[PDB]
Design an enzyme around this catalytic site. Sequence first.
Site, PDB file in Angstrom:
ATOM      1  CE  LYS C   3     -46.813  40.969  12.595  1.00 42.31           C
ATOM      2  NZ  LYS C   3     -45.836  41.992  12.101  1.00 42.31           N
ATOM      3  CD  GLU C  29     -46.153  43.352   2.756  1.00 44.40           C
ATOM      4  OE1 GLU C  29     -46.609  42.183   2.807  1.00 44.40           O
ATOM      5  OE2 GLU C  29     -46.250  44.141   3.729  1.00 44.40           O
ATOM      6  NE  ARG C  30     -38.721  42.045   5.496  1.00 51.12           N
ATOM      7  CZ  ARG C  30     -39.485  42.384   6.537  1.00 51.12           C
ATOM      8  NH1 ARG C  30     -40.802  42.171   6.521  1.00 51.12           N
ATOM      9  NH2 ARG C  30     -38.933  42.939   7.599  1.00 51.12           N
TER      10      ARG C  30
END
Lengths: 57, 461, 154, 476, 475, 167
Positions: C3, C29-30
Amino acid sequence: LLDAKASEFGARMTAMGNATDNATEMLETLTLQFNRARQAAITQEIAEIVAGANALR
Amino acid sequence: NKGRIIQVMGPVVDIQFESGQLPDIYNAITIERPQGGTLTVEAAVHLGDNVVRCVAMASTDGLVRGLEAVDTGAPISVPVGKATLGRVFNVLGEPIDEQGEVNAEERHPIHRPAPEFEELSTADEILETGIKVIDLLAPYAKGGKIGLFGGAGVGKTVLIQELINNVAQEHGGLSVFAGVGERTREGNDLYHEMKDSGVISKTSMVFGQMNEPPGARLRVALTGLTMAEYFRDREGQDVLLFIDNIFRFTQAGSEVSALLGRMPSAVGYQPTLATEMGQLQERITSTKKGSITSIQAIYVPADDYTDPAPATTFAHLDATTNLERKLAEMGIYPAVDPLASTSRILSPAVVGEEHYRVARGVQQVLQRYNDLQDIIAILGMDELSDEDKLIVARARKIQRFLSQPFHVAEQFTGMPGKYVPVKETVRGFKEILEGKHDNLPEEAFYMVGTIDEAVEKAKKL
Amino acid sequence: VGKTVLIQELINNVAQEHGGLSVFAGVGERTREGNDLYHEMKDSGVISKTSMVFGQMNEPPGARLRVALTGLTMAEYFRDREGQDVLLFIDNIFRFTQAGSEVSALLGRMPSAVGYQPTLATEMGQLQERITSTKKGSITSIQAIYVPADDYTD
Amino acid sequence: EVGTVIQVGDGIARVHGLEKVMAGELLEFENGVMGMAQNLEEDNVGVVILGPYTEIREGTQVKRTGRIMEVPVGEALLGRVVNPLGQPLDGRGPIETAEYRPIESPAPGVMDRKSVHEPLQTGIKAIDSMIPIGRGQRELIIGDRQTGKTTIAIDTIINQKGQDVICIYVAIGQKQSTVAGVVETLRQHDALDYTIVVTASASEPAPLLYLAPYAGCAMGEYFMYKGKHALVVYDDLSKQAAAYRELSLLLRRPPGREAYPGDVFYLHSRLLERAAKLSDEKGGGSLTALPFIETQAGDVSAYIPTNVISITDGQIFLESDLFYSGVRPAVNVGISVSRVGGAAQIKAMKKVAGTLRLDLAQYRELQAFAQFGSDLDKATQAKLNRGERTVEILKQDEHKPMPVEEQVISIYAVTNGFMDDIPVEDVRRFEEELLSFMRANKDSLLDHIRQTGELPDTKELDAAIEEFKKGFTPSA
Amino acid sequence: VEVGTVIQVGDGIARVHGLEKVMAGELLEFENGVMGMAQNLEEDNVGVVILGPYTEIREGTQVKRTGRIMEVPVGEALLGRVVNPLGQPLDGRGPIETAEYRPIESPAPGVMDRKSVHEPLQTGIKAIDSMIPIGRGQRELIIGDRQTGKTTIAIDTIINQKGQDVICIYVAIGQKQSTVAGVVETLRQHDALDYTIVVTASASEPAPLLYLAPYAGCAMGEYFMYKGKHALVVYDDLSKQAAAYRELSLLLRRPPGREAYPGDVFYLHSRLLERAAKLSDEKGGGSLTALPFIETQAGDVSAYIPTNVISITDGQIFLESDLFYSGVRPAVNVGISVSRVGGAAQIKAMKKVAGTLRLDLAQYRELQAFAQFGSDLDKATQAKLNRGERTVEILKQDEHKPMPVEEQVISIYAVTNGFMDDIPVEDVRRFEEELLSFMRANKDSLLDHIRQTGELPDTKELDAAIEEFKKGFTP
Amino acid sequence: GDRQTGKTTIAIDTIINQKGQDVICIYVAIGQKQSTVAGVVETLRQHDALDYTIVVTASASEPAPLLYLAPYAGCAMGEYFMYKGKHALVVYDDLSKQAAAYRELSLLLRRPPGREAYPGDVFYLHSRLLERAAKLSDEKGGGSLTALPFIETQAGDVSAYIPTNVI
Ligand SMILES: Nc1ncnc2c1ncn2[C@@H]1O[C@H](COP(=O)(O)OP(=O)(O)O)[C@@H](O)[C@H]1O
Ligand SMILES: Nc1ncnc2c1ncn2[C@@H]1O[C@H](COP(=O)(O)OP(=O)(O)O)[C@@H](O)[C@H]1O
Ligand SMILES: Nc1ncnc2c1ncn2[C@@H]1O[C@H](COP(=O)(O)OP(=O)(O)O)[C@@H](O)[C@H]1O
Ligand SMILES: Nc1ncnc2c1ncn2[C@@H]1O[C@H](COP(=O)(O)OP(=O)(O)O)[C@@H](O)[C@H]1O
Ligand SMILES: Nc1ncnc2c1ncn2[C@@H]1O[C@H](COP(=O)(O)OP(=O)(O)O)[C@@H](O)[C@H]1O
Ligand SMILES: [Mg+2]
Ligand SMILES: [Mg+2]
Ligand SMILES: [Mg+2]
Ligand SMILES: [Mg+2]
């Protein structure tokens, strides 16, 4: 007997072939029902929670 | 400390008091009825403007606005100790057996903090029940907490009575039976059953049944448990605490909740479901001073084990017996799910190496059979491998040998009951797994005790 | 499966040949994976062709609801005032919708079907309709999409 | 003492004044229509109207009666059709009675009862053998629409002819034409003389549907507390629960699961606990209850059905699949049960039936698994052959009740193998021919059972059946 | 102080007049010494959630501000101790001698304060360390039904940190207290208690303590992370924490959403789990690794709270009942479970041998339909089924018996290169136990290579040593 | 039909084929992407079908009440021609998005939700709209309004609530 065995295994190939296809067809209509039910559980459960809370607020 | 009734709304009564003479939460409050008699009532919420919302412990029909109400100054308080033995009480600690006063030295309040962490051990020693499915697959531990889960009409009360029959009759210590929100008919039968066997004199009984208003059903369990706490803490004893049914405590909580003004949680339960349960359940335990072996029937609404009530109840248990309607409909009694039922002590360390191996063997065979049920229903039994057809054969024999006639169920089964010791249960299932009885017909294993009785029943077929 | 490698190659190949820029909006987002994606883009060199916006998993719902608009606003400049074909990457556009339902709940709004906010469709339209081709240029959006319970009808 | 109506809508009124009113008190409006004080609020009263409410408006006056919610009771109600207020709907004039009884009343406590021990014979083999009902029992009748629930209760009432058992048929939420049909069926079978009929028809306001079962309960309680025996039928509690939901929602009480109020369990549990078997000290009388639940698509695990299942002493589940396959009455043997069991059966029937339910539950499981392949070993083959025959015995026509002595013989015959050599299609005719033989020729055996409640000498009985067998010609 | 007075009390909540200048989240003291927390700052009251017995709190009781946000005692004094979320000792071994405190709510390391996770956290469980590898600084969800073996995974993981210089924190939210006493005793017996802190909000405690319990444990572990050391925190479980926060939110009349949870229930867990991290070299290189738990109902991983926590963490270990009862214990669904960090959290030896295990089992799971057709199948698929059943047996593992990584690498190497293909399936687990006791006693130079280098030894020497063992093995 | 099954192209082709048939066309675009609507007008222009066609548009970014009103506006625009004895054609593309918009509105006004959270009057929403399309009698001028409402199904589920309403 060997022609008859080939005929057995051809007939079985095409019978279990159809049963595989019919199973995928039934999995579509079962998935469709499962997700109506899943969605309706969440939808209906929440309305109940919110109806209870609006009788106090 | 006096007050005036301002509102009455089902089992909830709002009472106005004078500035700064407000009853503490959980205090008992008496109201003299116009019709004669006293209605006791429990303080719940302080609404402001010197009003207290209270939960009634009996019917509020007949009350009028403006009646006098009196703060008793403490929670509902109940007799404890040896005067309770042989007697039958209601939620308030008043005897309902029509045998005069209870001359008890002390009266304890039914609300109380849980035992400290320091006071608790674990229960690691097996309690033989004589019931094959339990002893083998999900054994009960002495001084542990044991849950009987089931939907409506699957055998919770029959099972709880069979445990009373099999364990309590030869029990060295004392007992308490708390009938929380279940059938008055069954309390009456259990009273007479215990009177005839003579166990009654070793047992205190408390009834707040399904006919009573919510307040009664909410608090009756605490009354019973307060009596058991005495026998543990102040006579160092082994106590048996039976509760049928602990769901009805949680259900009564949800009945009051809407009128106490709390916003409802998932599935209409009170938002304080988990904490209310913990405050009750953590008191039901074995301490260093004494031991309580507690066996609690737990209703499962709509047969749904994911319902918030039973789901939260699982956290409080050292063994479980999960009754399933599917098994009851097949005629398998007791209707015990042999895969869903569990015990903390089903380990080689406690039951020994052979027991564990056999039990896991049984569960492996049943699980495999379960997986093939779908395949068999469509593709048919001839198309299975030789290994699988043998597994299905044994699984069905195993499934039947887990059934057992109960002493208490002589009316329903029509057969005499059977007590089967652990050694024999292990031996029987070991032999079925080993193949020693592959030629006995299936009906042979159904509703028998020992493996020897199955061999004997085969001859009659 | 590739990805991030693919998203960087698109940033590179839009930048090399058409001369357009990119924006990455991390919606939920992490933080660990933001840090990795920064360094990953710095090493491949695509970083200099890309603005990055992170409304991370630990931020309140409002932040996660609106961070995509922040990214989109940067891309709108490059379209409208430098006539570029711009790439907007959004990972994950479901978490935009989910943050919407979280904030709707706290505003006290009555839930719609399956517990989503009643403004589900309009909130999505207000984001999506800004991602479009005008006469001055284009924004193409490339959106990672979570599917709850494997149900494409959700 | 008077109060005035502030607001009214959908048969619910808020009333100013009535300061001294009791919670649950009966009230009379200006125009003679009754009401019930439900909510005592800080300066008004919530009142549910128990009758036509078009002529009630803002300004209409309400009088207290100083009496708790009450209904007429006694022998004057026998053969009459009344509403939940005890007012005659059949147009045969007033109900001459001096005795009243409160609609809400406490149930017999733990010490006031005796274990149920006396049969209530339905006259239906399936029920009296496998799911036995006793005097003081609560037995749920549950099933989809058109599975045969009402006909079970009507046949049970008819079979109480001359048994000195007072029957009460409570009709909650039915169409009134149907209720007229029920009374006419009772009349024709000469069962109306000992039967009271309470009816809150579908057009009545919700509070009357709510009260209808409690009224019928009080009407039967009267006989219980005088040492007589009664039977009450609530047809059905599904519609009562819906009505109580309507009421609770109109009073703006917070809804829970499926919009029912939190106390919908309590609604049914207080009702059904008042049915009981009293102790010898309290007169030995009984009230037996047959509540009804109407399921949707056979879902017995739904909220309201599980509530009522967990209240009663067992259930009789009826299924459409069974009904249309020719099993009538359509009793699901696996899911049905009697928690009282053998105690509610004569010793003869307890002997022959002992394991019958468990045997058929095992039959039905083994039958399902036998159509999935295998050529079966001779042991399981015989169990299936015995099973199909006992199923045929438990089939039974509607309005054709059997005496218990004849049931015991019929069940004895099939369970001891006397029909194993007979074709399955001939079993039902074999039974009819056997019993007409036993009645005409071997009545001394039947009479033994009627008098002693015990089986006769099994050798004499075996001989008498084998005697009959020699005059029976099969069809195949 | 300014003081405030209680307007209303019920169900562990008080509404308080006054306290005009109070902060959101401030600690408050009621007249009788019972603490509370300011949660809702309303137009004409303060909503205060009571952190103790509330029977003695009434209308009129007075409340003092403390001016302080929640803090908890921290440091090495907590090791081997059992405490509540306020840091008060429950084990009855007297006070906790520490001068350092730390705030319960604290910001997470930002995007620039971190380094990519690269260091193993060895659970000692073959299934996990090979297929779903956890690394220092990772958040890995353990999710499954009741009685699927979740707590025993975390207990075994803590036990395996013996001598690894990793401080462990077991946070027990909503459990029965007897169970928690059982956990501490199991740790004591495996000599894992002296490096482990135990935080406990038992089921009888008020909801706000269940709510705070995970944040307290987090702060206790953060202390070690920010000094350049390495910690491990276990939240068992977040399902009960979320329910507790819902109870609280509903009592404060905050609007409910899905399953009656508040809008910020996602935020509740995301704040918590983002505070676990791997710091950069500049910030000291320390780590906090997190193992949150979710308890599903009937395997429903698409429910609200489970989906929240799945979308927060760096992967998940799903456990199944069907696997458990079929004898696959630990009952790890290897196909569906995931580590987003992956090979980065593995020594080179394990990354090499596990490469082939994954492909072997993927082929096994596809071909599993054909297992009732034994010896009808062509010889290629027959061998794939035989390899598959054997690797499954290797990944079964006894409870409280963690394995060193060097021994795992050898065991997985053995089965994946065919050294057990000659052996009966029923003998595989004993073959492994006998192989490793042989390798420890006789071939320790090979094992030691792996402990030092993290690489495989020379494959020819290793093949020989296994084949040497094989000649002394009796089926 | 489902998304991308060729629904809009049927209506566009139908409008184009009314060239020279003396039929006034109205394309109502409820909740579509605006790029698509720009594409539709351009396709009509190129086939010389735009000069007899009115285009009403409440794009996906517009507030819900405009999506709610869009079909009624188009209906009135076509009714004008019907009641003067001329012939019109109205296309509602699509009523699925209109119903969702009216749900948003009903829920913001706290009107009680029912099946799939739609209000009780969501049937009435479509029924009043579509009954206004008709063929008038000779006495009333003989004019007509023909209607092509659209429904977007999910996974071919024609038994869902809104699809069954409109069927
Ligand atoms: N186009 C490619 N060519 C070679 N290797 C690739 C390619 N795309 C991905 N990979 C390999 O796969 C690994 C994982 O891909 P990555 O982009 O991290 O996927 P994701 O973003 O899904 O995590 C990369 O680090 C790289 O080794
Ligand atoms: N045992 C039976 N044999 C034949 N028909 C029956 C039997 N029981 C009921 N029926 C018929 O089934 C229909 C439904 O009966 P009913 O009592 O109205 O069921 P319910 O009350 O459950 O709707 C009626 O036509 C009735 O005559
Ligand atoms: N061991 C058993 N033997 C025979 N019948 C049983 C047994 N256990 C349960 N049953 C049947 O199931 C019925 C329900 O049992 P009960 O405990 O009364 O229900 P609940 O689960 O509602 O508490 C009993 O009346 C009995 O007929
Ligand atoms: N790997 C294993 N092998 C054998 N038994 C196990 C294993 N893991 C757990 N158990 C046993 O299974 C049960 C599961 O308990 P636990 O580990 O607490 O799971 P959970 O936390 O999901 O309930 C316990 O009785 C435990 O002794
Ligand atoms: N008859 C056709 N021949 C070729 N392509 C078609 C045809 N009908 C539709 N399409 C193509 O299919 C795509 C989707 O059609 P459209 O009418 O927009 O479907 P919907 O409106 O249901 O999304 C369009 O981009 C169009 O180019
Ligand atoms: Mg029971
Ligand atoms: Mg009927
Ligand atoms: Mg656990
Ligand atoms: Mg289209």
